[PDB]
PDB file of C-alpha atoms in Angstrom:
ATOM      1  CA  UNK A   1       2.477   9.907  13.891  1.00 49.17           C
ATOM      2  CA  UNK A   2       6.212   9.331  14.050  1.00 48.21           C
ATOM      3  CA  UNK A   3       8.601   8.186  11.308  1.00 47.83           C
ATOM      4  CA  UNK A   4      11.780   7.578  13.342  1.00 47.97           C
ATOM      5  CA  UNK A   5      14.562   9.334  11.229  1.00 46.96           C
ATOM      6  CA  UNK A   6      13.146  10.643   7.933  1.00 49.26           C
ATOM      7  CA  UNK A   7      13.445  13.927   6.030  1.00 47.77           C
ATOM      8  CA  UNK A   8      10.398  16.007   6.937  1.00 45.94           C
ATOM      9  CA  UNK A   9       9.613  16.110   3.161  1.00 48.18           C
ATOM     10  CA  UNK A  10       9.429  12.266   3.093  1.00 49.84           C
ATOM     11  CA  UNK A  11       7.171  12.059   6.138  1.00 50.37           C
ATOM     12  CA  UNK A  12       4.760  14.553   4.582  1.00 49.88           C
ATOM     13  CA  UNK A  13       4.749  12.780   1.224  1.00 49.69           C
ATOM     14  CA  UNK A  14       4.459   9.351   2.905  1.00 50.17           C
ATOM     15  CA  UNK A  15       2.592   9.540   6.252  1.00 47.29           C
ATOM     16  CA  UNK A  16       0.597  12.749   5.851  1.00 50.45           C
ATOM     17  CA  UNK A  17      -0.562  12.641   2.229  1.00 54.32           C
ATOM     18  CA  UNK A  18      -2.432   9.400   2.917  1.00 51.50           C
ATOM     19  CA  UNK A  19      -4.331  10.622   5.976  1.00 51.67           C
ATOM     20  CA  UNK A  20      -4.878  13.893   4.140  1.00 52.90           C
ATOM     21  CA  UNK A  21      -6.445  12.113   1.152  1.00 52.26           C
ATOM     22  CA  UNK A  22      -8.606  10.007   3.475  1.00 53.19           C
ATOM     23  CA  UNK A  23      -9.323  12.074   6.583  1.00 58.43           C
ATOM     24  CA  UNK A  24     -12.277  14.101   5.301  1.00 56.57           C
ATOM     25  CA  UNK A  25     -16.049  13.980   5.270  1.00 57.03           C
ATOM     26  CA  UNK A  26     -16.120  12.948   8.923  1.00 58.54           C
ATOM     27  CA  UNK A  27     -18.972  14.365  10.989  1.00 62.59           C
ATOM     28  CA  UNK A  28     -18.914  18.172  10.913  1.00 61.11           C
ATOM     29  CA  UNK A  29     -15.205  18.579  10.185  1.00 59.99           C
ATOM     30  CA  UNK A  30     -14.563  22.318  10.001  1.00 60.36           C
ATOM     31  CA  UNK A  31     -10.895  22.477   9.013  1.00 60.70           C
ATOM     32  CA  UNK A  32      -7.895  20.195   9.417  1.00 62.61           C
ATOM     33  CA  UNK A  33      -4.258  21.289   9.392  1.00 65.11           C
ATOM     34  CA  UNK A  34      -1.076  19.239   9.525  1.00 67.06           C
ATOM     35  CA  UNK A  35       2.542  19.889  10.429  1.00 65.27           C
ATOM     36  CA  UNK A  36       5.657  17.659  10.027  1.00 63.62           C
ATOM     37  CA  UNK A  37       8.756  18.868  11.932  1.00 63.33           C
ATOM     38  CA  UNK A  38      12.475  18.090  11.755  1.00 66.13           C
ATOM     39  CA  UNK A  39      12.541  15.269  14.332  1.00 60.23           C
ATOM     40  CA  UNK A  40      10.240  13.017  12.289  1.00 56.75           C
ATOM     41  CA  UNK A  41       6.909  13.789  13.961  1.00 57.01           C
ATOM     42  CA  UNK A  42       3.785  14.705  11.999  1.00 57.43           C
ATOM     43  CA  UNK A  43       0.745  15.939  13.896  1.00 59.19           C
ATOM     44  CA  UNK A  44      -2.628  16.721  12.338  1.00 55.62           C
ATOM     45  CA  UNK A  45      -5.110  18.929  14.180  1.00 52.77           C
ATOM     46  CA  UNK A  46      -8.646  18.450  12.875  1.00 53.00           C
ATOM     47  CA  UNK A  47     -11.044  21.067  14.244  1.00 57.36           C
ATOM     48  CA  UNK A  48     -14.717  20.158  13.899  1.00 55.51           C
TER      49      UNK A  48
ATOM     50  CA  UNK B   1     -12.032 -24.101 -11.214  1.00 53.04           C
ATOM     51  CA  UNK B   2      -8.966 -26.251 -11.129  1.00 48.23           C
ATOM     52  CA  UNK B   3      -7.981 -29.716  -9.837  1.00 52.35           C
ATOM     53  CA  UNK B   4      -4.252 -29.753  -9.113  1.00 52.55           C
ATOM     54  CA  UNK B   5      -3.471 -33.493  -9.634  1.00 52.24           C
ATOM     55  CA  UNK B   6      -1.455 -33.917  -6.396  1.00 47.81           C
ATOM     56  CA  UNK B   7      -0.397 -37.433  -7.406  1.00 43.93           C
ATOM     57  CA  UNK B   8       1.311 -36.115 -10.539  1.00 43.92           C
ATOM     58  CA  UNK B   9       2.942 -33.321  -8.542  1.00 41.02           C
ATOM     59  CA  UNK B  10       4.602 -35.851  -6.244  1.00 42.04           C
ATOM     60  CA  UNK B  11       5.252 -38.131  -9.213  1.00 44.39           C
ATOM     61  CA  UNK B  12       6.587 -35.155 -11.161  1.00 42.55           C
ATOM     62  CA  UNK B  13       8.561 -33.908  -8.172  1.00 40.06           C
ATOM     63  CA  UNK B  14       7.166 -30.363  -8.148  1.00 40.75           C
ATOM     64  CA  UNK B  15       6.485 -28.397  -4.973  1.00 41.04           C
ATOM     65  CA  UNK B  16       2.824 -27.604  -4.362  1.00 42.98           C
ATOM     66  CA  UNK B  17       3.566 -24.081  -3.129  1.00 43.31           C
ATOM     67  CA  UNK B  18       5.110 -23.339  -6.515  1.00 40.48           C
ATOM     68  CA  UNK B  19       1.899 -24.293  -8.341  1.00 42.50           C
ATOM     69  CA  UNK B  20      -0.096 -22.198  -5.882  1.00 43.51           C
ATOM     70  CA  UNK B  21       2.246 -19.253  -6.415  1.00 40.55           C
ATOM     71  CA  UNK B  22       2.082 -19.561 -10.192  1.00 38.51           C
ATOM     72  CA  UNK B  23      -1.722 -19.627 -10.316  1.00 36.97           C
ATOM     73  CA  UNK B  24      -2.353 -16.875  -7.770  1.00 38.84           C
ATOM     74  CA  UNK B  25       0.319 -14.591  -9.206  1.00 37.91           C
ATOM     75  CA  UNK B  26      -0.660 -15.360 -12.797  1.00 38.09           C
ATOM     76  CA  UNK B  27      -4.113 -13.917 -12.238  1.00 40.05           C
ATOM     77  CA  UNK B  28      -3.812 -11.549  -9.280  1.00 42.79           C
ATOM     78  CA  UNK B  29      -2.576  -8.085 -10.341  1.00 44.15           C
ATOM     79  CA  UNK B  30      -0.713  -7.594  -7.069  1.00 46.06           C
ATOM     80  CA  UNK B  31       0.431  -4.216  -5.770  1.00 47.29           C
ATOM     81  CA  UNK B  32       3.936  -3.732  -4.386  1.00 47.95           C
ATOM     82  CA  UNK B  33       4.854  -0.265  -3.101  1.00 46.73           C
ATOM     83  CA  UNK B  34       4.822   3.384  -4.145  1.00 49.26           C
ATOM     84  CA  UNK B  35       7.067   5.617  -6.225  1.00 49.02           C
ATOM     85  CA  UNK B  36       7.252   9.415  -6.537  1.00 50.66           C
ATOM     86  CA  UNK B  37       5.513  10.443  -9.755  1.00 50.65           C
ATOM     87  CA  UNK B  38       5.575  14.221 -10.254  1.00 50.50           C
ATOM     88  CA  UNK B  39       5.515  14.980  -6.549  1.00 49.97           C
ATOM     89  CA  UNK B  40       2.870  12.405  -5.619  1.00 50.60           C
ATOM     90  CA  UNK B  41       3.374   8.869  -4.325  1.00 49.95           C
ATOM     91  CA  UNK B  42       1.639   6.584  -6.824  1.00 49.13           C
ATOM     92  CA  UNK B  43       1.385   2.814  -6.719  1.00 48.40           C
ATOM     93  CA  UNK B  44       3.526   0.299  -8.596  1.00 49.58           C
ATOM     94  CA  UNK B  45       1.271  -2.541  -9.707  1.00 48.43           C
ATOM     95  CA  UNK B  46       2.524  -5.738 -11.317  1.00 47.16           C
ATOM     96  CA  UNK B  47       0.345  -8.084 -13.358  1.00 45.05           C
ATOM     97  CA  UNK B  48       0.485 -10.772 -16.004  1.00 45.29           C
TER      98      UNK B  48
END
Protein backbone atom coordinates (compact mmCIF):
# COMPACT_ATOMS: atom_id res chain seq x y z
CA UNK A 1 0.00 0.00 0.00
CA UNK A 2 1.16 3.54 -0.67
CA UNK A 3 0.18 6.78 1.08
CA UNK A 4 1.80 9.35 -1.23
CA UNK A 5 3.61 11.78 1.24
CA UNK A 6 2.83 10.87 4.87
CA UNK A 7 4.93 10.47 8.02
CA UNK A 8 5.70 6.77 8.37
CA UNK A 9 4.01 6.96 11.83
CA UNK A 10 0.75 8.15 10.17
CA UNK A 11 0.79 5.42 7.53
CA UNK A 12 1.23 2.76 10.21
CA UNK A 13 -1.52 4.21 12.40
CA UNK A 14 -3.82 4.72 9.38
CA UNK A 15 -3.17 2.14 6.62
CA UNK A 16 -1.53 -0.69 8.57
CA UNK A 17 -3.49 -0.79 11.83
CA UNK A 18 -6.68 -1.53 9.89
CA UNK A 19 -5.31 -4.43 7.85
CA UNK A 20 -3.55 -5.60 11.00
CA UNK A 21 -6.82 -5.66 12.97
CA UNK A 22 -8.58 -7.45 10.11
CA UNK A 23 -5.99 -9.60 8.33
CA UNK A 24 -6.06 -12.65 10.59
CA UNK A 25 -7.77 -16.01 10.84
CA UNK A 26 -7.25 -16.63 7.13
CA UNK A 27 -6.50 -20.21 6.13
CA UNK A 28 -3.37 -21.47 7.91
CA UNK A 29 -1.75 -18.07 8.48
CA UNK A 30 1.52 -18.75 10.28
CA UNK A 31 2.83 -15.25 10.96
CA UNK A 32 2.37 -11.84 9.36
CA UNK A 33 4.79 -8.93 9.61
CA UNK A 34 4.50 -5.37 8.34
CA UNK A 35 6.91 -2.55 7.57
CA UNK A 36 6.24 1.14 6.70
CA UNK A 37 9.27 3.04 5.33
CA UNK A 38 10.13 6.72 4.87
CA UNK A 39 8.83 7.12 1.30
CA UNK A 40 5.22 6.33 2.27
CA UNK A 41 5.09 2.64 1.37
CA UNK A 42 3.77 -0.02 3.75
CA UNK A 43 4.23 -3.67 2.84
CA UNK A 44 2.85 -6.60 4.82
CA UNK A 45 4.32 -10.07 4.35
CA UNK A 46 1.94 -12.77 5.55
CA UNK A 47 3.60 -16.19 5.69
CA UNK A 48 1.17 -19.11 5.85
CA UNK B 1 -43.67 4.99 8.06
CA UNK B 2 -44.12 8.48 6.80
CA UNK B 3 -46.05 10.26 4.02
CA UNK B 4 -44.23 13.46 3.09
CA UNK B 5 -47.18 15.60 1.81
CA UNK B 6 -45.44 16.76 -1.41
CA UNK B 7 -48.27 19.19 -2.17
CA UNK B 8 -47.66 21.06 1.09
CA UNK B 9 -43.91 21.06 0.46
CA UNK B 10 -44.41 22.87 -2.85
CA UNK B 11 -47.15 24.99 -1.28
CA UNK B 12 -44.88 25.65 1.70
CA UNK B 13 -41.88 26.25 -0.54
CA UNK B 14 -39.55 23.75 1.14
CA UNK B 15 -37.00 21.66 -0.76
CA UNK B 16 -37.67 17.92 -0.68
CA UNK B 17 -33.99 17.06 -0.24
CA UNK B 18 -34.02 19.04 2.99
CA UNK B 19 -36.85 16.93 4.42
CA UNK B 20 -35.03 13.78 3.32
CA UNK B 21 -31.83 15.00 4.95
CA UNK B 22 -33.59 15.91 8.19
CA UNK B 23 -35.30 12.52 8.54
CA UNK B 24 -32.33 10.36 7.56
CA UNK B 25 -29.88 12.34 9.67
CA UNK B 26 -32.29 12.61 12.59
CA UNK B 27 -32.35 8.85 12.99
CA UNK B 28 -29.15 7.56 11.41
CA UNK B 29 -26.18 7.74 13.82
CA UNK B 30 -23.74 8.43 11.00
CA UNK B 31 -19.99 7.97 11.28
CA UNK B 32 -17.58 10.62 10.02
CA UNK B 33 -13.85 9.92 10.37
CA UNK B 34 -11.26 8.88 12.94
CA UNK B 35 -9.27 10.65 15.64
CA UNK B 36 -6.19 9.58 17.61
CA UNK B 37 -7.31 8.45 21.07
CA UNK B 38 -4.37 7.31 23.21
CA UNK B 39 -2.36 6.07 20.26
CA UNK B 40 -5.23 4.35 18.46
CA UNK B 41 -7.43 5.71 15.68
CA UNK B 42 -11.00 5.56 17.00
CA UNK B 43 -14.17 6.62 15.22
CA UNK B 44 -16.05 9.90 15.61
CA UNK B 45 -19.76 9.13 15.48
CA UNK B 46 -22.47 11.77 15.38
CA UNK B 47 -26.10 11.13 16.30
CA UNK B 48 -29.26 12.85 17.43
